[PDB]
Amino acid sequence: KVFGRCELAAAMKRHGLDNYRGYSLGNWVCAAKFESNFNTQATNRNTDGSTDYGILQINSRWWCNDGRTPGSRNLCNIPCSALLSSDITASVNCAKKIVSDGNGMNAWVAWRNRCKGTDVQAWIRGCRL
């Protein structure tokens, strides 16, 4: 499912991400935009052999099991395919563990390079929230 911007903002709000660990909702929508272009089915393979999965491009070396990343830790205790669902609940639950891990949203490279320090409020403007 390719989400609409305001559609994704409402689903992320319902799931408790607005101001989760201090990060306002616009940060999360910006991160989804640049990590996956709002597409739940996005996957991208990395040089170390791990793969990033879903709307927030969660990585198989640490967070989910895909059966082909040697020494994967599977900290969200889910198969990575669960992260490609039209229902974003597993992606949101795992993202909450990731953002709690110490480095905050700097865990997402597209957030640090394209969202951090910009006016992220623009990502939810015009939405009925």
MMTF fields as JSON, N, C-alpha, C and O atoms, coordinates in Angstrom:
{
  "mmtfVersion": "1.0.0",
  "mmtfProducer": "UNKNOWN",
  "numBonds": 515,
  "numAtoms": 516,
  "numGroups": 129,
  "numChains": 1,
  "numModels": 1,
  "chainsPerModel": [1],
  "groupsPerChain": [129],
  "chainIdList": ["A"],
  "bondAtomList": [4, 2, 8, 6, 12, 10, 16, 14, 20, 18, 24, 22, 28, 26, 32, 30, 36, 34, 40, 38, 44, 42, 48, 46, 52, 50, 56, 54, 60, 58, 64, 62, 68, 66, 72, 70, 76, 74, 80, 78, 84, 82, 88, 86, 92, 90, 96, 94, 100, 98, 104, 102, 108, 106, 112, 110, 116, 114, 120, 118, 124, 122, 128, 126, 132, 130, 136, 134, 140, 138, 144, 142, 148, 146, 152, 150, 156, 154, 160, 158, 164, 162, 168, 166, 172, 170, 176, 174, 180, 178, 184, 182, 188, 186, 192, 190, 196, 194, 200, 198, 204, 202, 208, 206, 212, 210, 216, 214, 220, 218, 224, 222, 228, 226, 232, 230, 236, 234, 240, 238, 244, 242, 248, 246, 252, 250, 256, 254, 260, 258, 264, 262, 268, 266, 272, 270, 276, 274, 280, 278, 284, 282, 288, 286, 292, 290, 296, 294, 300, 298, 304, 302, 308, 306, 312, 310, 316, 314, 320, 318, 324, 322, 328, 326, 332, 330, 336, 334, 340, 338, 344, 342, 348, 346, 352, 350, 356, 354, 360, 358, 364, 362, 368, 366, 372, 370, 376, 374, 380, 378, 384, 382, 388, 386, 392, 390, 396, 394, 400, 398, 404, 402, 408, 406, 412, 410, 416, 414, 420, 418, 424, 422, 428, 426, 432, 430, 436, 434, 440, 438, 444, 442, 448, 446, 452, 450, 456, 454, 460, 458, 464, 462, 468, 466, 472, 470, 476, 474, 480, 478, 484, 482, 488, 486, 492, 490, 496, 494, 500, 498, 504, 502, 508, 506, 512, 510],
  "bondOrderList": [1, 1, 1, 1, 1, 1, 1, 1, 1, 1, 1, 1, 1, 1, 1, 1, 1, 1, 1, 1, 1, 1, 1, 1, 1, 1, 1, 1, 1, 1, 1, 1, 1, 1, 1, 1, 1, 1, 1, 1, 1, 1, 1, 1, 1, 1, 1, 1, 1, 1, 1, 1, 1, 1, 1, 1, 1, 1, 1, 1, 1, 1, 1, 1, 1, 1, 1, 1, 1, 1, 1, 1, 1, 1, 1, 1, 1, 1, 1, 1, 1, 1, 1, 1, 1, 1, 1, 1, 1, 1, 1, 1, 1, 1, 1, 1, 1, 1, 1, 1, 1, 1, 1, 1, 1, 1, 1, 1, 1, 1, 1, 1, 1, 1, 1, 1, 1, 1, 1, 1, 1, 1, 1, 1, 1, 1, 1, 1],
  "groupList": [{"groupName": "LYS", "atomNameList": ["N", "CA", "C", "O"], "elementList": ["N", "C", "C", "O"], "formalChargeList": [0, 0, 0, 0], "bondAtomList": [1, 0, 2, 1, 3, 2], "bondOrderList": [1, 1, 2], "singleLetterCode": "K", "chemCompType": "L-PEPTIDE LINKING"}, {"groupName": "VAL", "atomNameList": ["N", "CA", "C", "O"], "elementList": ["N", "C", "C", "O"], "formalChargeList": [0, 0, 0, 0], "bondAtomList": [1, 0, 2, 1, 3, 2], "bondOrderList": [1, 1, 2], "singleLetterCode": "V", "chemCompType": "L-PEPTIDE LINKING"}, {"groupName": "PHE", "atomNameList": ["N", "CA", "C", "O"], "elementList": ["N", "C", "C", "O"], "formalChargeList": [0, 0, 0, 0], "bondAtomList": [1, 0, 2, 1, 3, 2], "bondOrderList": [1, 1, 2], "singleLetterCode": "F", "chemCompType": "L-PEPTIDE LINKING"}, {"groupName": "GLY", "atomNameList": ["N", "CA", "C", "O"], "elementList": ["N", "C", "C", "O"], "formalChargeList": [0, 0, 0, 0], "bondAtomList": [1, 0, 2, 1, 3, 2], "bondOrderList": [1, 1, 2], "singleLetterCode": "G", "chemCompType": "PEPTIDE LINKING"}, {"groupName": "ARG", "atomNameList": ["N", "CA", "C", "O"], "elementList": ["N", "C", "C", "O"], "formalChargeList": [0, 0, 0, 0], "bondAtomList": [1, 0, 2, 1, 3, 2], "bondOrderList": [1, 1, 2], "singleLetterCode": "R", "chemCompType": "L-PEPTIDE LINKING"}, {"groupName": "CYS", "atomNameList": ["N", "CA", "C", "O"], "elementList": ["N", "C", "C", "O"], "formalChargeList": [0, 0, 0, 0], "bondAtomList": [1, 0, 2, 1, 3, 2], "bondOrderList": [1, 1, 2], "singleLetterCode": "C", "chemCompType": "L-PEPTIDE LINKING"}, {"groupName": "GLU", "atomNameList": ["N", "CA", "C", "O"], "elementList": ["N", "C", "C", "O"], "formalChargeList": [0, 0, 0, 0], "bondAtomList": [1, 0, 2, 1, 3, 2], "bondOrderList": [1, 1, 2], "singleLetterCode": "E", "chemCompType": "L-PEPTIDE LINKING"}, {"groupName": "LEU", "atomNameList": ["N", "CA", "C", "O"], "elementList": ["N", "C", "C", "O"], "formalChargeList": [0, 0, 0, 0], "bondAtomList": [1, 0, 2, 1, 3, 2], "bondOrderList": [1, 1, 2], "singleLetterCode": "L", "chemCompType": "L-PEPTIDE LINKING"}, {"groupName": "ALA", "atomNameList": ["N", "CA", "C", "O"], "elementList": ["N", "C", "C", "O"], "formalChargeList": [0, 0, 0, 0], "bondAtomList": [1, 0, 2, 1, 3, 2], "bondOrderList": [1, 1, 2], "singleLetterCode": "A", "chemCompType": "L-PEPTIDE LINKING"}, {"groupName": "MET", "atomNameList": ["N", "CA", "C", "O"], "elementList": ["N", "C", "C", "O"], "formalChargeList": [0, 0, 0, 0], "bondAtomList": [1, 0, 2, 1, 3, 2], "bondOrderList": [1, 1, 2], "singleLetterCode": "M", "chemCompType": "L-PEPTIDE LINKING"}, {"groupName": "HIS", "atomNameList": ["N", "CA", "C", "O"], "elementList": ["N", "C", "C", "O"], "formalChargeList": [0, 0, 0, 0], "bondAtomList": [1, 0, 2, 1, 3, 2], "bondOrderList": [1, 1, 2], "singleLetterCode": "H", "chemCompType": "L-PEPTIDE LINKING"}, {"groupName": "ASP", "atomNameList": ["N", "CA", "C", "O"], "elementList": ["N", "C", "C", "O"], "formalChargeList": [0, 0, 0, 0], "bondAtomList": [1, 0, 2, 1, 3, 2], "bondOrderList": [1, 1, 2], "singleLetterCode": "D", "chemCompType": "L-PEPTIDE LINKING"}, {"groupName": "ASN", "atomNameList": ["N", "CA", "C", "O"], "elementList": ["N", "C", "C", "O"], "formalChargeList": [0, 0, 0, 0], "bondAtomList": [1, 0, 2, 1, 3, 2], "bondOrderList": [1, 1, 2], "singleLetterCode": "N", "chemCompType": "L-PEPTIDE LINKING"}, {"groupName": "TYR", "atomNameList": ["N", "CA", "C", "O"], "elementList": ["N", "C", "C", "O"], "formalChargeList": [0, 0, 0, 0], "bondAtomList": [1, 0, 2, 1, 3, 2], "bondOrderList": [1, 1, 2], "singleLetterCode": "Y", "chemCompType": "L-PEPTIDE LINKING"}, {"groupName": "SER", "atomNameList": ["N", "CA", "C", "O"], "elementList": ["N", "C", "C", "O"], "formalChargeList": [0, 0, 0, 0], "bondAtomList": [1, 0, 2, 1, 3, 2], "bondOrderList": [1, 1, 2], "singleLetterCode": "S", "chemCompType": "L-PEPTIDE LINKING"}, {"groupName": "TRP", "atomNameList": ["N", "CA", "C", "O"], "elementList": ["N", "C", "C", "O"], "formalChargeList": [0, 0, 0, 0], "bondAtomList": [1, 0, 2, 1, 3, 2], "bondOrderList": [1, 1, 2], "singleLetterCode": "W", "chemCompType": "L-PEPTIDE LINKING"}, {"groupName": "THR", "atomNameList": ["N", "CA", "C", "O"], "elementList": ["N", "C", "C", "O"], "formalChargeList": [0, 0, 0, 0], "bondAtomList": [1, 0, 2, 1, 3, 2], "bondOrderList": [1, 1, 2], "singleLetterCode": "T", "chemCompType": "L-PEPTIDE LINKING"}, {"groupName": "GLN", "atomNameList": ["N", "CA", "C", "O"], "elementList": ["N", "C", "C", "O"], "formalChargeList": [0, 0, 0, 0], "bondAtomList": [1, 0, 2, 1, 3, 2], "bondOrderList": [1, 1, 2], "singleLetterCode": "Q", "chemCompType": "L-PEPTIDE LINKING"}, {"groupName": "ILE", "atomNameList": ["N", "CA", "C", "O"], "elementList": ["N", "C", "C", "O"], "formalChargeList": [0, 0, 0, 0], "bondAtomList": [1, 0, 2, 1, 3, 2], "bondOrderList": [1, 1, 2], "singleLetterCode": "I", "chemCompType": "L-PEPTIDE LINKING"}, {"groupName": "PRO", "atomNameList": ["N", "CA", "C", "O"], "elementList": ["N", "C", "C", "O"], "formalChargeList": [0, 0, 0, 0], "bondAtomList": [1, 0, 2, 1, 3, 2], "bondOrderList": [1, 1, 2], "singleLetterCode": "P", "chemCompType": "L-PEPTIDE LINKING"}],
  "groupTypeList": [0, 1, 2, 3, 4, 5, 6, 7, 8, 8, 8, 9, 0, 4, 10, 3, 7, 11, 12, 13, 4, 3, 13, 14, 7, 3, 12, 15, 1, 5, 8, 8, 0, 2, 6, 14, 12, 2, 12, 16, 17, 8, 16, 12, 4, 12, 16, 11, 3, 14, 16, 11, 13, 3, 18, 7, 17, 18, 12, 14, 4, 15, 15, 5, 12, 11, 3, 4, 16, 19, 3, 14, 4, 12, 7, 5, 12, 18, 19, 5, 14, 8, 7, 7, 14, 14, 11, 18, 16, 8, 14, 1, 12, 5, 8, 0, 0, 18, 1, 14, 11, 3, 12, 3, 9, 12, 8, 15, 1, 8, 15, 4, 12, 4, 5, 0, 3, 16, 11, 1, 17, 8, 15, 18, 4, 3, 5, 4, 7],
  "groupIdList": [1, 2, 3, 4, 5, 6, 7, 8, 9, 10, 11, 12, 13, 14, 15, 16, 17, 18, 19, 20, 21, 22, 23, 24, 25, 26, 27, 28, 29, 30, 31, 32, 33, 34, 35, 36, 37, 38, 39, 40, 41, 42, 43, 44, 45, 46, 47, 48, 49, 50, 51, 52, 53, 54, 55, 56, 57, 58, 59, 60, 61, 62, 63, 64, 65, 66, 67, 68, 69, 70, 71, 72, 73, 74, 75, 76, 77, 78, 79, 80, 81, 82, 83, 84, 85, 86, 87, 88, 89, 90, 91, 92, 93, 94, 95, 96, 97, 98, 99, 100, 101, 102, 103, 104, 105, 106, 107, 108, 109, 110, 111, 112, 113, 114, 115, 116, 117, 118, 119, 120, 121, 122, 123, 124, 125, 126, 127, 128, 129],
  "secStructList": [7, 5, 7, 7, 2, 2, 2, 2, 2, 2, 2, 2, 2, 2, 6, 6, 7, 6, 6, 5, 6, 6, 5, 7, 2, 2, 2, 2, 2, 2, 2, 2, 2, 2, 2, 2, 6, 6, 5, 6, 6, 7, 3, 3, 3, 7, 6, 6, 1, 7, 3, 3, 3, 6, 6, 6, 6, 3, 3, 6, 6, 6, 6, 7, 5, 7, 1, 7, 1, 6, 6, 7, 7, 7, 6, 6, 7, 1, 5, 4, 4, 4, 4, 4, 1, 1, 1, 7, 2, 2, 2, 2, 2, 2, 2, 2, 2, 2, 2, 2, 1, 1, 1, 4, 4, 4, 4, 1, 2, 2, 2, 2, 2, 2, 6, 6, 6, 1, 7, 4, 4, 4, 4, 4, 6, 6, 7, 7, 7],
  "xCoordList": [0.871, 0.0, 0.917, 1.847, 0.644, 1.309, 0.302, -0.813, 0.716, -0.138, -0.17, 0.79, -1.296, -1.356, -0.675, -0.602, -0.179, 0.53, -0.345, 0.058, -1.54, -2.428, -2.992, -3.24, -3.205, -3.618, -2.578, -2.925, -1.304, -0.257, -0.134, 0.024, -0.199, -0.132, -1.226, -0.949, -2.463, -3.546, -3.303, -3.572, -2.805, -2.507, -1.349, -1.413, -0.293, 0.811, 0.374, 0.834, -0.505, -1.074, -1.872, -1.67, -2.78, -3.577, -2.72, -3.064, -1.599, -0.661, 0.29, 1.163, 0.177, 0.944, 2.288, 3.122, 2.568, 3.872, 3.967, 5.09, 2.881, 3.014, 3.565, 2.984, 4.743, 5.623, 6.156, 6.49, 6.245, 6.823, 8.319, 9.003, 8.828, 10.211, 10.619, 11.796, 9.669, 9.954, 9.852, 10.005, 9.605, 9.604, 8.205, 7.38, 7.912, 6.578, 6.223, 7.104, 4.914, 4.413, 5.029, 5.253, 5.317, 5.927, 7.265, 7.618, 8.024, 9.3, 9.119, 9.863, 8.11, 7.815, 7.307, 7.701, 6.447, 5.944, 7.083, 7.165, 7.958, 9.104, 10.002, 10.437, 10.284, 11.13, 10.525, 11.239, 9.24, 8.569, 8.661, 8.905, 8.467, 8.583, 9.926, 9.988, 11.005, 12.287, 12.83, 13.712, 12.388, 12.887, 12.2, 12.865, 10.891, 10.16, 9.239, 8.648, 9.117, 8.142, 6.706, 5.862, 6.463, 5.176, 4.664, 3.468, 5.598, 5.253, 5.62, 6.796, 4.59, 4.787, 5.611, 6.212, 5.642, 6.34, 7.763, 8.415, 8.313, 9.692, 10.727, 10.62, 11.719, 12.81, 14.097, 14.062, 15.232, 16.493, 17.602, 17.751, 18.388, 19.476, 20.715, 20.997, 21.459, 22.677, 23.904, 23.811, 25.044, 26.347, 26.75, 27.37, 26.426, 26.756, 25.807, 25.919, 24.877, 23.962, 22.647, 21.784, 22.463, 21.188, 20.232, 20.661, 18.961, 17.983, 17.12, 16.871, 16.671, 15.751, 14.343, 14.124, 13.377, 12.008, 10.942, 10.938, 10.031, 8.818, 8.912, 9.874, 7.843, 7.545, 8.672, 8.966, 9.301, 10.377, 11.707, 12.623, 11.813, 13.045, 13.858, 15.01, 13.238, 13.843, 14.779, 14.434, 15.935, 17.043, 17.074, 16.815, 17.387, 17.376, 18.56, 18.526, 19.613, 20.74, 20.422, 20.914, 19.605, 19.268, 17.83, 17.56, 16.896, 15.532, 14.556, 13.605, 14.689, 13.673, 14.417, 15.556, 13.796, 14.423, 13.936, 12.737, 14.873, 14.51, 15.121, 14.968, 15.794, 16.359, 17.602, 18.051, 18.185, 19.343, 20.336, 21.177, 20.3, 21.243, 21.957, 21.401, 23.178, 23.94, 24.186, 24.694, 23.799, 24.032, 23.051, 23.354, 21.855, 20.791, 20.408, 20.414, 20.073, 19.671, 18.163, 17.753, 17.33, 15.869, 15.251, 14.453, 15.632, 15.166, 13.688, 13.127, 13.018, 11.587, 10.793, 9.563, 11.5, 10.966, 9.801, 8.714, 10.085, 9.125, 9.894, 11.079, 9.275, 9.821, 9.775, 8.813, 10.792, 10.832, 9.652, 9.242, 9.09, 7.931, 6.739, 5.868, 6.658, 5.564, 5.603, 4.574, 6.789, 6.968, 6.501, 6.569, 6.027, 5.601, 4.09, 3.572, 3.398, 1.957, 1.335, 1.946, 0.13, -0.631, -0.985, -1.129, -1.118, -1.348, 0.03, 0.933, 0.207, 1.531, 1.821, 2.885, 0.965, 1.172, 2.523, 3.186, 3.004, 4.301, 5.433, 6.366, 5.395, 6.423, 6.453, 7.534, 5.295, 5.259, 5.811, 6.595, 5.425, 5.906, 7.406, 8.044, 7.982, 9.405, 10.123, 11.168, 9.599, 10.143, 10.223, 11.18, 9.212, 9.237, 10.414, 11.002, 10.8, 11.996, 13.25, 14.174, 13.283, 14.463, 14.719, 15.847, 13.707, 13.904, 14.227, 14.742, 13.929, 14.268, 15.701, 16.195, 16.373, 17.678, 18.87, 19.968, 18.775, 19.96, 20.26, 20.604, 20.139, 20.475, 19.272, 19.398, 18.098, 16.882, 16.582, 16.845, 16.038, 15.699, 16.925, 16.775, 18.133, 19.355, 19.613, 20.447, 18.897, 18.9, 18.422, 18.768, 17.646, 17.178, 18.007, 17.94, 18.799, 19.692, 18.94, 19.427, 17.766, 17.031, 16.486, 16.352, 16.168, 15.706, 16.866, 16.697, 18.021, 19.132, 19.527, 19.843, 19.523, 20.036, 19.026, 19.403, 17.736, 16.715, 15.598, 14.845, 15.461, 14.372, 14.89, 14.344, 15.936, 16.489, 16.838, 17.58, 16.257, 16.463, 15.654, 15.887, 14.726, 13.929, 12.602, 12.377, 11.728, 10.426, 9.566, 8.83, 9.658, 8.919, 7.411, 6.664, 6.923, 5.493, 4.829, 3.642, 5.557, 5.01, 4.429, 3.507, 4.958, 4.518, 3.13, 2.532, 2.594, 1.239, 0.322, -0.834, 0.803, -0.085, -1.201, -0.957, -2.433, -3.594, -4.284, -5.334, -3.751, -4.359, -5.356, -5.15, -6.437, -7.427, -6.922, -7.073, -6.325, -5.71, -6.241, -5.809],
  "yCoordList": [-1.156, 0.0, 1.216, 1.309, 2.142, 3.435, 4.343, 4.554, 4.872, 5.725, 7.135, 7.613, 7.809, 9.238, 9.894, 9.27, 11.113, 11.797, 11.95, 11.538, 12.539, 12.761, 11.458, 11.342, 10.468, 9.121, 8.47, 7.895, 8.557, 7.977, 8.735, 8.096, 10.058, 10.855, 10.436, 10.29, 10.233, 9.801, 8.412, 8.189, 7.456, 6.122, 6.128, 5.415, 6.909, 7.055, 7.716, 7.315, 8.72, 9.37, 8.355, 8.248, 7.599, 6.591, 5.561, 5.093, 5.22, 4.276, 4.873, 4.153, 6.151, 6.688, 7.231, 7.343, 7.585, 8.15, 9.649, 10.139, 10.433, 11.88, 12.15, 11.833, 12.766, 13.08, 11.903, 12.028, 10.747, 9.57, 9.837, 10.079, 9.794, 10.109, 11.521, 11.772, 12.438, 13.836, 14.177, 15.35, 13.23, 13.5, 13.73, 12.817, 14.95, 15.282, 14.471, 13.97, 14.356, 13.582, 13.941, 13.043, 15.223, 15.608, 14.911, 14.647, 14.602, 13.912, 12.505, 12.071, 11.803, 10.435, 10.389, 9.489, 11.32, 11.36, 11.717, 11.134, 12.646, 13.007, 11.787, 11.503, 11.061, 9.871, 8.835, 8.304, 8.522, 7.592, 8.052, 7.236, 9.347, 9.899, 9.607, 9.083, 9.941, 9.778, 8.392, 8.035, 7.559, 6.2, 5.3, 4.469, 5.435, 4.488, 5.06, 4.332, 6.39, 7.125, 6.684, 6.628, 6.37, 5.966, 4.603, 4.318, 3.773, 2.46, 1.365, 1.147, 0.666, -0.399, -1.572, -2.307, -1.75, -2.894, -2.595, -3.479, -1.407, -1.116, -2.001, -2.244, -2.478, -3.244, -2.702, -2.276, -2.679, -2.265, -3.044, -3.062, -3.696, -4.5, -3.654, -2.736, -3.94, -3.23, -4.076, -5.289, -3.427, -4.052, -5.097, -6.087, -4.929, -5.946, -7.153, -8.08, -7.185, -8.299, -8.21, -9.066, -7.213, -7.08, -6.379, -5.896, -6.328, -5.675, -4.832, -5.189, -3.701, -2.793, -3.05, -3.266, -3.022, -3.415, -2.413, -1.892, -2.146, -1.401, 0.113, 0.729, 0.665, 2.089, 2.857, 3.992, 2.251, 2.91, 2.19, 2.381, 1.355, 0.699, 0.123, 0.498, -0.793, -1.394, -2.518, -3.321, -2.563, -3.397, -4.802, -4.965, -5.803, -7.204, -7.651, -8.756, -6.847, -7.257, -7.195, -8.017, -6.232, -6.008, -6.256, -6.738, -5.94, -5.822, -6.874, -7.112, -7.533, -8.496, -9.632, -9.455, -10.793, -11.94, -12.188, -12.33, -12.239, -12.546, -13.862, -14.191, -14.625, -15.913, -15.867, -16.928, -14.709, -14.661, -13.611, -13.213, -13.126, -12.115, -12.836, -12.936, -13.344, -14.064, -13.162, -12.046, -13.703, -12.989, -11.853, -10.847, -12.071, -11.159, -11.293, -12.405, -10.18, -10.228, -10.384, -10.829, -10.034, -10.038, -9.449, -10.101, -8.21, -7.581, -7.225, -7.151, -6.998, -6.764, -8.055, -8.032, -9.204, -10.573, -10.787, -11.228, -10.452, -10.548, -10.993, -10.679, -11.708, -11.88, -10.549, -9.795, -10.248, -8.972, -8.776, -7.635, -9.837, -9.724, -9.131, -8.541, -9.258, -8.643, -7.124, -6.458, -6.579, -5.144, -4.601, -3.391, -5.453, -5.031, -4.96, -4.605, -5.304, -5.271, -3.891, -2.871, -3.862, -2.63, -2.034, -0.82, -2.909, -2.538, -2.165, -3.003, -0.949, -0.562, -0.896, -0.507, -1.586, -1.813, -2.434, -1.915, -3.502, -4.07, -3.085, -3.007, -2.323, -1.325, -0.29, 0.065, 0.211, 1.202, 0.653, 1.335, -0.567, -1.172, -1.369, -1.165, -1.77, -1.958, -0.601, -0.46, 0.396, 1.757, 2.369, 3.075, 2.095, 2.537, 1.943, 2.65, 0.668, 0.105, 0.755, 1.069, 0.959, 1.558, 2.964, 3.267, 3.828, 5.212, 5.331, 6.357, 4.291, 4.232, 3.789, 3.947, 3.239, 2.63, 3.542, 2.998, 4.859, 5.631, 6.727, 7.837, 6.452, 7.462, 8.149, 8.958, 7.839, 8.514, 8.3, 7.218, 9.297, 9.102, 9.166, 8.963, 9.438, 9.375, 7.971, 7.788, 6.974, 5.619, 5.571, 4.625, 6.539, 6.57, 7.594, 8.79, 7.108, 7.946, 9.002, 10.126, 8.677, 9.671, 10.732, 11.886, 10.403, 11.437, 12.388, 13.605, 11.867, 12.748, 13.614, 14.787, 13.093, 13.879, 14.78, 15.767, 14.472, 15.234, 15.816, 16.66, 15.401, 15.908, 16.676, 17.73, 16.185, 16.796, 18.241, 18.57, 19.086, 20.524, 21.238, 22.43, 20.612, 21.313, 21.589, 21.138, 22.314, 22.513, 21.279, 21.238, 20.28, 19.034, 19.214, 18.334, 20.318, 20.589, 20.638, 20.326, 21.023, 21.068, 19.732, 19.71, 18.604, 17.258, 16.895, 15.955, 17.604, 17.3, 18.504, 18.477, 19.553, 20.693, 20.348, 19.658, 20.826, 20.54, 19.251, 18.942, 18.475, 17.201, 17.364, 18.177, 16.599, 16.64, 15.635, 14.426, 16.135, 15.298, 15.577, 14.94],
  "zCoordList": [0.0, 0.0, 0.0, 0.801, -0.905, -0.932, -0.206, -0.682, 0.948, 1.757, 1.235, 0.63, 1.474, 1.269, 2.473, 3.532, 2.355, 3.433, 4.684, 5.771, 4.539, 5.692, 6.209, 7.409, 5.352, 5.739, 6.641, 7.673, 6.259, 7.072, 8.4, 9.44, 8.402, 9.62, 10.582, 11.773, 10.125, 10.996, 11.548, 12.728, 10.759, 11.263, 12.26, 13.261, 12.019, 12.958, 14.267, 15.336, 14.203, 15.387, 16.194, 17.404, 15.557, 16.24, 16.963, 18.048, 16.337, 16.9, 17.916, 18.4, 18.273, 19.366, 19.033, 19.931, 17.781, 17.494, 17.684, 17.803, 17.724, 17.874, 19.281, 20.319, 19.2, 20.304, 21.068, 22.247, 20.416, 21.036, 21.177, 20.183, 22.412, 22.782, 22.378, 22.117, 22.325, 21.998, 20.508, 20.166, 19.607, 18.184, 17.709, 17.736, 17.266, 16.805, 15.547, 14.847, 15.277, 14.142, 12.799, 11.987, 12.524, 11.256, 11.042, 9.893, 12.081, 11.932, 11.364, 10.484, 11.892, 11.51, 10.079, 9.337, 9.65, 8.274, 7.321, 6.24, 7.678, 6.871, 6.683, 5.566, 7.775, 7.716, 6.789, 5.938, 6.913, 6.004, 4.544, 3.655, 4.294, 2.946, 2.31, 1.198, 3.007, 2.396, 2.547, 1.766, 3.487, 3.575, 2.562, 1.944, 2.369, 1.544, 0.506, -0.29, 0.517, -0.277, -0.002, -0.896, 1.285, 1.846, 1.357, 1.408, 0.882, 0.338, 1.316, 1.61, 1.826, 2.812, 2.286, 3.068, 0.966, 0.371, 0.001, -0.554, 0.264, -0.127, 0.574, 1.776, -0.164, 0.419, -0.169, -1.323, 0.519, -0.115, 0.515, 1.737, -0.322, 0.168, 0.424, -0.345, 1.483, 1.821, 1.541, 1.353, 1.515, 1.21, 2.195, 1.806, 3.482, 4.465, 4.335, 5.138, 3.362, 3.169, 3.927, 3.736, 4.773, 5.429, 4.447, 3.399, 4.786, 3.942, 4.869, 6.021, 4.332, 5.006, 4.497, 3.305, 5.439, 5.159, 5.547, 6.662, 4.611, 4.871, 4.878, 4.419, 5.431, 5.498, 6.196, 5.823, 7.202, 7.882, 7.723, 8.523, 6.681, 6.292, 7.445, 7.662, 8.177, 9.344, 8.9, 8.032, 9.491, 9.053, 9.663, 10.855, 8.86, 9.269, 10.099, 10.642, 10.226, 11.049, 12.531, 13.304, 12.94, 14.335, 14.714, 15.814, 13.834, 14.3, 13.861, 14.606, 12.726, 12.316, 11.645, 11.213, 11.549, 10.951, 9.53, 9.291, 8.591, 7.224, 6.753, 5.577, 7.586, 7.21, 6.329, 5.896, 6.036, 5.156, 5.617, 4.812, 6.872, 7.359, 8.504, 9.598, 8.28, 9.293, 10.501, 10.388, 11.679, 12.936, 13.182, 13.823, 12.634, 12.82, 14.298, 14.827, 14.981, 16.38, 16.596, 17.667, 15.618, 15.725, 17.001, 17.674, 17.318, 18.559, 18.598, 19.691, 17.455, 17.477, 17.441, 17.498, 17.345, 17.346, 16.377, 16.749, 15.119, 14.043, 12.798, 12.687, 11.861, 10.511, 9.763, 9.912, 8.968, 8.269, 7.319, 7.104, 6.743, 5.89, 6.644, 6.004, 7.97, 8.716, 8.574, 8.69, 8.323, 8.142, 6.796, 6.581, 5.874, 4.554, 4.397, 3.338, 5.472, 5.56, 5.33, 5.649, 4.782, 4.619, 6.0, 6.149, 6.983, 8.365, 8.951, 8.951, 9.439, 9.897, 11.329, 11.81, 12.059, 13.469, 13.783, 14.68, 13.131, 13.461, 13.178, 13.976, 12.07, 11.805, 12.908, 13.379, 13.339, 14.406, 15.712, 16.371, 16.112, 17.348, 17.378, 18.412, 16.236, 16.142, 16.106, 16.741, 15.388, 15.345, 16.744, 17.063, 17.579, 18.968, 19.725, 20.543, 19.503, 20.142, 19.593, 20.344, 18.274, 17.656, 18.198, 18.589, 18.231, 18.648, 20.144, 20.587, 20.911, 22.316, 22.585, 23.702, 21.581, 21.704, 21.999, 22.12, 22.128, 22.492, 21.507, 21.912, 20.212, 19.203, 18.621, 17.701, 19.147, 18.767, 17.296, 16.772, 16.617, 15.226, 14.313, 13.108, 14.824, 13.999, 13.464, 12.577, 14.0, 13.475, 12.031, 11.323, 11.558, 10.204, 9.468, 9.752, 8.506, 7.713, 6.908, 6.783, 6.356, 5.578, 6.544, 6.136, 7.797, 8.727, 9.067, 8.981, 9.445, 9.747, 8.567, 8.764, 7.35, 6.237, 5.588, 4.956, 5.722, 5.001, 5.862, 5.377, 7.112, 7.909, 9.095, 9.42, 9.764, 10.956, 10.66, 9.734, 11.503, 11.443, 10.366, 10.171, 9.653, 8.664, 9.342, 10.465, 8.688, 9.283, 9.012, 8.026, 9.883, 9.691, 9.841, 9.414, 10.43, 10.571, 9.223, 9.119, 8.17, 6.824, 6.371, 5.555, 6.89, 6.52, 7.005, 6.481, 7.987, 8.434, 8.196, 8.619, 7.536, 7.338, 6.35, 5.361, 6.611, 5.766, 6.165, 5.602, 7.108, 7.471, 8.599, 9.5, 8.557, 9.61, 10.634, 10.453, 11.704, 12.71, 14.114, 15.075]
}
